[PDB]
């Protein structure tokens, strides 16, 4: 009968639906790889899409996925077994090196500009009209690093121009050098700011920007990368 | 303890964003409303400006009326009592003419056709709204999802007050503008097709309702836990990845065994939510039309 | 084995337990130690499954069922064939869950990332043994709980439901069903959003999310953003999900008799009671 019918053909375009999904969530990270970097011999039962093509704005280029895929970087890693699946351990300073929970990828030396062709984000002196409109205002707090030791003080906010969202706290360090912190790895209390991710002797080491004014896709990248990676290789310095 | 980014820490102001222009008519736009503190501590505090016009008003305009020729029907019903309409407020109910009338529209004003009156007036108001939301799309140049999407949640909506009531040949099969009464309808509905748990639509469509609730849990926990990369931002993220992508790609393939991309998890999204009311849809308008006990078909399957 | 991108990230750490011991994938997979801990609570709770099909002879999971012991036994433990097999399971199962939820934990720290995955999973975790220890408990007895089989928990839930007369006067269930309507509501809406900008009419370039924002200023005044809708998600999912808990948690326990009965106390406060006409005079 007719519902008989309907509930059959239903579970058909399921199926084709569920393979377009799955196909269409390829367009990236394929072919899979040998942990050498050669492609693997197994890619499943699915192929690939065929590609599709974005036209970015700004006259910023297009995008084409799928399409060679190239890490753009040497990985500072080396194998710990003499058969696939185990891990990788780092030949030098994860950190430093930028591998493990410290990973950044190889994105734009451009900073993200909003609808109209300005950079995105902005220091708030250069943002003009921004202010706090609410919450404990951070500029001016000495930063606290998880050994519990003072590293810098907060002397700007970046913020998001569009969302009027606050992205970073600019940070002020004992040599007069600013570094920029992610707004999401800290917590603002009411006489200092506390990263539980750095001790205070890494935030040296948190990548520096090219200009005062921007932040790109390859430093925000970098940045984030690196301070996420502290939980994890700052552990040693990070006290209760 | 870590911050876990639930709600901000920290507001920053600055002048209203009248937003981008492409192909839209200025002058149909109202002026930016106040700025919400409160907003502000979740999502963005900027209120407006909202984007009125021919279709907006004769949507809103429908709308109220529907809300309207309901409250009216309420406050007879309440005996004019402001005390009463207070207490009985779930106990009051718009109903349908009674099979008698079967889809004439002679039906009387305290025995139905106020009934067909409000009805109209909510099929004017949704089908405006809808168009609505297609324009409104089309003069930003952007993919009209968001309308393909709405048509879905319109499709059970349509089945459930217009295309079954009009295949089984009356008005009485439509469901009541009241809060308890639209509630009694719906268990009244199961009881009478010999139990809504044997549709297999049903059950698909609460797979998918269920299914939302699983997936905007999974997307939400993803993007909120890869933000501290600019996780948020994903549409850079799609024209360009970043750590905050892959870290989320490798967390669900370390997991589960696969991954989606920054669109694809989007594409998931946007299917696993339209098929709710789709197979809803499909699932209500076989029920009495082509079956008439969902028991006695799944013990034969036809 | 790897995406094209994924070598990086196989670095060495983040267990909680064990050390480097199970510290490894399998193929796409990661293991840890609590991938081991999920492999043996699910092989065993399968196996324990296959079992009671045997005692109940049927080979067709339409018809397998795994059913708690009878109201007789109290909190106390039931014979294998009667009752016994589903304790044992949903031990297995709990065991399954938490496991699987620690294992998320370990990934989370190996890519350095938050928490908020295996914290919004606890959620169900919740429900689920809201529904087979936390209510039964209170009740009294491990048969208030619903069995392991298809169609059978279907029985159970339209049964429980009716118990009570029509449930969807149970005030909680309500407002838990607002929220899975509304989350539903909201998944469309976003995944639409962030699709429309990405894929735009033919030829034009992907909108910006300033677009989008506008977009949406412009249908209903107003646009909660990009950390926003993410925010909003995961909030109504796991509301729905807490309130379900709750209307299932009260009922039985602090209210048994009939939902659409509760509501009198509105209507029966003194200042609008015995005031003539409407519906309820
Ligand atoms: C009875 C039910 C009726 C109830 C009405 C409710 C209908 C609600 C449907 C909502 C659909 C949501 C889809 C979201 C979406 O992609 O929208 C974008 C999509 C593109 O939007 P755009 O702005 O035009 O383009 C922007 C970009 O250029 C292009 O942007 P893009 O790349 O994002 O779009 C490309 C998109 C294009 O999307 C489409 O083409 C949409 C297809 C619509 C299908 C409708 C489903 C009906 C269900 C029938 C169930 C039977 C029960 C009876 O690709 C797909 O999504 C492909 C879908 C794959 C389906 C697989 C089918 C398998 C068939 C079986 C094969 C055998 C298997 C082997 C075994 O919109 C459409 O294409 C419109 C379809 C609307 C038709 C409505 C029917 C009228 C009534
Ligand atoms: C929480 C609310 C009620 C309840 C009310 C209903 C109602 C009402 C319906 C279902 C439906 C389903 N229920 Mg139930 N269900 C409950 C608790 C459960 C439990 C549990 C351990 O707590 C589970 C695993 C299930 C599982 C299921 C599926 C068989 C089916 C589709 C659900 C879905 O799409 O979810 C979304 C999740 C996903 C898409 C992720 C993938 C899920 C897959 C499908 C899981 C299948 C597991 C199953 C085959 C058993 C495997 C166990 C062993 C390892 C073999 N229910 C409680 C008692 N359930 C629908 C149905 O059609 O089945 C008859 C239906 O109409
Ligand atoms: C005793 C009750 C019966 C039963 C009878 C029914 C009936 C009858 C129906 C459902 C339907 C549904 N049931 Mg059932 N159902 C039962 C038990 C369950 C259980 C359970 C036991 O755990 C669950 C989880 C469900 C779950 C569900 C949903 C999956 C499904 C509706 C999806 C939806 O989101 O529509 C919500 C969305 C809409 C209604 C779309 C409307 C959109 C419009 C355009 C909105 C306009 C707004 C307007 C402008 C005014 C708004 C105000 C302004 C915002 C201010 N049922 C039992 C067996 N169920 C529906 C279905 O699809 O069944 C197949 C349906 O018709
Ligand atoms: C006749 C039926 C009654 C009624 C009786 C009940 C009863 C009784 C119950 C509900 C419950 C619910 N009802 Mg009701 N309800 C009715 C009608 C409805 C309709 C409606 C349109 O009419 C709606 C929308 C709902 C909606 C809902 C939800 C609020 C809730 C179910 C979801 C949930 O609890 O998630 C909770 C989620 C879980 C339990 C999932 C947990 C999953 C676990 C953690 C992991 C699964 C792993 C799995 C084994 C994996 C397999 C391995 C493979 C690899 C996949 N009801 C009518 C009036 N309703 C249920 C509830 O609130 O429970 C608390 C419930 O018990
Ligand atoms: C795909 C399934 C889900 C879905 C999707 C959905 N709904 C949608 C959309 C989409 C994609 C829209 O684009 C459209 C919208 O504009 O939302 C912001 C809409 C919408 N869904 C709405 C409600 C709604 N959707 C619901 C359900 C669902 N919508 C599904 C779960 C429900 C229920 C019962 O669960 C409700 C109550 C509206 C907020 C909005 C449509 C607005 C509209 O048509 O207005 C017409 C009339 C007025 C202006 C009345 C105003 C009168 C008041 C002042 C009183
Ligand atoms: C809290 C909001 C919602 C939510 C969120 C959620 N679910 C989640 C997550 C999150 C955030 C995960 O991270 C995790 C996941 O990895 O998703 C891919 C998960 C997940 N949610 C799942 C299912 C699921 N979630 C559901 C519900 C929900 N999940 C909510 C609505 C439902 C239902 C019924 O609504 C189901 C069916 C899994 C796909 C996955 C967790 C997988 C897992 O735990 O693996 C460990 C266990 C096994 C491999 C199998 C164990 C076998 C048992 C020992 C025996 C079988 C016993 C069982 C009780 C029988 C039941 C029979 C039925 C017919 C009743
Ligand atoms: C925006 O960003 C995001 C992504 O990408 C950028 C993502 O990908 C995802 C992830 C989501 C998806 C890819 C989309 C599709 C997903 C769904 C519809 C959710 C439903 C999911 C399922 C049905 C899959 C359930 C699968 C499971 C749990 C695993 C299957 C596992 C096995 C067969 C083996 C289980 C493992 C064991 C026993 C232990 C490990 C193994 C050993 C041998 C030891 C999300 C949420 C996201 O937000
Ligand atoms: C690229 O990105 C994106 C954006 O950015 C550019 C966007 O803007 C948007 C747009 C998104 C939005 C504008 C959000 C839209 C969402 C909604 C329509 C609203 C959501 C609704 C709710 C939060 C309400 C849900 C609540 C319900 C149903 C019930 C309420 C009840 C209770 C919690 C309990 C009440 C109780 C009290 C006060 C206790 C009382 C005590 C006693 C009686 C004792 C999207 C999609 C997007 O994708
Ligand atoms: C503030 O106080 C005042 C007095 C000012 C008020 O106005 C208060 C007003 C309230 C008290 C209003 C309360 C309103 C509600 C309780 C409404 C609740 C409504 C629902 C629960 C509706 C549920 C379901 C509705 C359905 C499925 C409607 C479907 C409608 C249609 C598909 C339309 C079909 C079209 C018809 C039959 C006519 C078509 C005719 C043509 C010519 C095309
Ligand atoms: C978006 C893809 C995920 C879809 C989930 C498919 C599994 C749902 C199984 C529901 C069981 C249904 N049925 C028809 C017997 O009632
Ligand atoms: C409709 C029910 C679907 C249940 C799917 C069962 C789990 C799917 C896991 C697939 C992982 C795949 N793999 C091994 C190819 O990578
Ligand atoms: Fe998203």
């Given at each position: 009968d007719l519902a008989s019918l309907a509930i059959y053909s239903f579970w058909i375009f399921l199926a084709g639906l569920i393979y377009y999904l799955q196909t269409e969530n390829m367009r990236e990270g394929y072919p899979?790889?040998?942990?050498d970097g050669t492609?693997?011999?197994?890619?499943?039962?699915?192929?690939?899409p065929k590609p599709k093509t974005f036209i970015l704005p700004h006259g910023r280029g297009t995008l084409t996925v799928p399409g060679p895929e190239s890490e753009d970087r040497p990985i500072a890693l080396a194998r710990t077994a003499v058969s696939e699946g185990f891990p990788h351990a780092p030949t030098g300073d994860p950190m430093k090196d930028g591998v493990g929970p410290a990973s950044w990828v190889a994105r734009r030396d451009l900073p993200e500009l909003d609808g109209h062709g300005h950079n995105k984000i902005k220091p708030m002196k250069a943002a003009a009209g921004?202010?706090?409109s609410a919450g404990k205002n951070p500029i001016g707090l000495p930063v606290r690093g998880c050994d519990l030791?003072?590293?810098?003080?907060?002397?700007?906010?970046?913020?998001?121009?569009?969302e009027q969202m606050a992205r970073f706290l600019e940070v002020e360090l004992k040599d007069?050098?600013?570094?920029?912190?992610?707004?999401?790895?800290?917590?603002?209390?009411?006489?200092?700011?506390?990263?539980?991710?750095?001790?205070?002797?890494?935030?040296?080491?948190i990548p520096t920007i090219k200009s005062p004014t921007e932040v790109t896709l390859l430093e925000e990248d970098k940045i984030c990368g690196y301070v996420a990676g502290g939980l994890m290789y700052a552990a040693p310095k990070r006290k209760s | 303890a870590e911050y876990q980014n639930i709600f901000s820490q920290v507001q920053v102001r600055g002048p209203a964003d009248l937003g981008m222009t492409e192909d839209v008519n200025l002058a149909n736009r109202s002026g930016v409303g106040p700025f919400s503190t409160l907003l502000g501590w979740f999502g963005n505090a900027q209120?407006?400006?909202?984007?009125?016009?021919?279709?907006?008003?004769?949507?809103?305009?429908?709308?109220?009326?529907?809300?309207?020729?309901?409250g009216i029907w309420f406050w007879y019903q309440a005996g004019w009592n402001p005390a009463v309409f207070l207490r009985d407020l779930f106990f009051f109910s718009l109903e349908p003419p009674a099979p008698e009338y079967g889809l004439s529209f002679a039906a009387p004003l305290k025995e139905g056709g106020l009934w067909l009156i409000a009805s109209f007036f909510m099929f004017v108001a949704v089908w405006s709204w809808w168009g609505r939301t297609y324009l409104r799309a089309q003069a930003l140049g952007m993919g009209k999802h968001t309308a393909w999407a709405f048509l879905s949640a319109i499709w059970l909506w349509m089945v459930l007050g217009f295309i079954r009531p009009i295949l089984m040949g009356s008005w009485s099969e439509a469901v009541p503008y009241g809060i308890f009464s639209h509630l009694d309808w719906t268990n009244n509905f199961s009881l009478v097709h010999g139990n809504l748990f044997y549709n297999p639509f049903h059950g698909l469509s609460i797979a998918f309702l269920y299914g939302s609730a699983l997936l905007f849990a999974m997307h939400g926990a993803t993007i909120l836990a890869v933000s501290r990369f600019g996780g948020e931002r994903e549409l850079e993220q799609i024209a360009d990845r970043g750590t905050a992508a892959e870290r989320a790609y490798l967390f669900w393939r370390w997991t589960m065994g696969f991954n989606a991309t920054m669109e694809g998890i989007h594409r998931w999204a946007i299917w696993m939510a339209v098929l709710v009311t789709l197979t809803g849809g499909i699932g209500i308008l076989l029920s009495g039309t082509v079956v008439d006990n969902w028991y006695v078909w799944?013990?034969?399957?036809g | 084995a790897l995406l094209s991108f994924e070598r990086k990230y196989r670095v060495p750490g983040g267990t909680l337990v064990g050390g480097n011991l199970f510290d490894f994938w399998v193929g796409p997979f990661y293991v840890g130690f609590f991938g081991v801990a999920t492999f043996f609570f699910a092989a065993l709770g399968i196996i324990l499954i296959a079992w009671s099909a045997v005692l109940q002879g049927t080979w067709n999971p339409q018809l397998i069922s795994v059913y708690p012991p009878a109201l007789e036994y109290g909190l106390g433990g039931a014979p294998l064939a009667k009752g016994g097999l589903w304790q044992i399971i949903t031990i297995c199962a709990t065991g399954a869950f938490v496991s699987w939820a620690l294992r998320e934990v370990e990934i989370c720290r190996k890519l350095g990332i938050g928490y908020h995955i295996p914290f919004a999973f606890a959620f169900a975790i919740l429900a689920y043994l809201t529904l087979v220890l936390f209510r039964p408990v209170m009740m009294g007895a491990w048969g208030y709980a619903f069995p392991y089989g298809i169609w059978t928990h279907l029985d159970w839930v339209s049964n429980t439901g009716?118990?009570?007369?029509?449930?969807?006067?149970?005030?909680?269930?309500?407002?838990?069903?607002?929220?899975?309507?509304?989350?539903?509501?909201?998944?469309?809406?976003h995944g639409a959003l962030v699709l429309s900008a990405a894929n735009p009419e033919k030829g034009k370039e992907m909108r910006t999310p300033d677009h989008a924002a506008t977009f949406f200023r412009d249908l209903v005044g107003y646009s909660i953003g990009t950390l926003g809708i993410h925010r909003l998600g995961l909030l109504l999912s796991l509301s729905a999900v807490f309130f379900s808990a709750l209307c299932m948690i009260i009922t039985g326990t602090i209210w048994f008799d009939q939902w659409v009965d509760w509501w009198q106390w509105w209507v029966k406060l003194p200042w609008w009671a015995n005031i003539p006409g409407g519906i309820n005079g």
């Open positions: 899979l790889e040998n942990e492609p693997a011999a197994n890619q499943g039962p699915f192929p690939l921004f202010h706090v030791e003072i590293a810098g003080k907060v002397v700007d906010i970046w913020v998001d121009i569009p007069g050098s600013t570094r920029l912190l992610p707004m999401q790895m800290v917590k603002v209390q009411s006489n200092r700011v506390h990263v539980n991710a750095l001790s205070s002797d890494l935030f040296a080491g | 209120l407006g400006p909202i984007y009125l016009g021919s279709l907006g008003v004769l949507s809103l305009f429908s709308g109220l009326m529907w809300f309207f020729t309901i799944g013990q034969n399957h | 009716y118990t009570y007369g029509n449930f969807h006067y149970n005030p909680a269930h309500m407002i838990a069903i607002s929220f899975f309507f509304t989350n539903a509501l909201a998944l469309a809406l």
